[PDB]
Amino acid sequence: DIKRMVEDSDLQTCYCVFDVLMVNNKKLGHETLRKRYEILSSIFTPIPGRIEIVQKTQAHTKNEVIDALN
DNA sequence: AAACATTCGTTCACGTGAGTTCCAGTACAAGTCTGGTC
Questions:
Q1: What family, per the record?
Q2: d(Cα A59, Cα A53) in Å, to the nearest integer?
Q3: Looking at strand B, which nucleotides approach a protein CB closer than 7 A?
Q4: Which of A18, A27, A61, A69 is the most buried (most CB within 10 A)?
């Protein structure tokens, strides 16, 4: 039940962010994914266990996709 | 001088390419039903 955390449970809630759509009266929804990913590193400094940024890896072949799936 | 062969413009039938209407296959999106736990 991440849907409803229990107080006695040892595990806690974590937020893995993979997009930003607005920062300081600047609308990022019409921008490219590259620029939003770049901006996402200038909003918060992640602290493991509570808030994090999902890692994206560059790839330009099908074999890379298959290796990641495996 | 008379008979037969050849040629010519005409005619019909049959075949092939391009335009138009109708329907089947495909794609995508939304709706509906179901499963599991906490």
A1: Belongs to the ATP-dependent DNA ligase family.
A2: 19
A3: 37-38
A4: A18
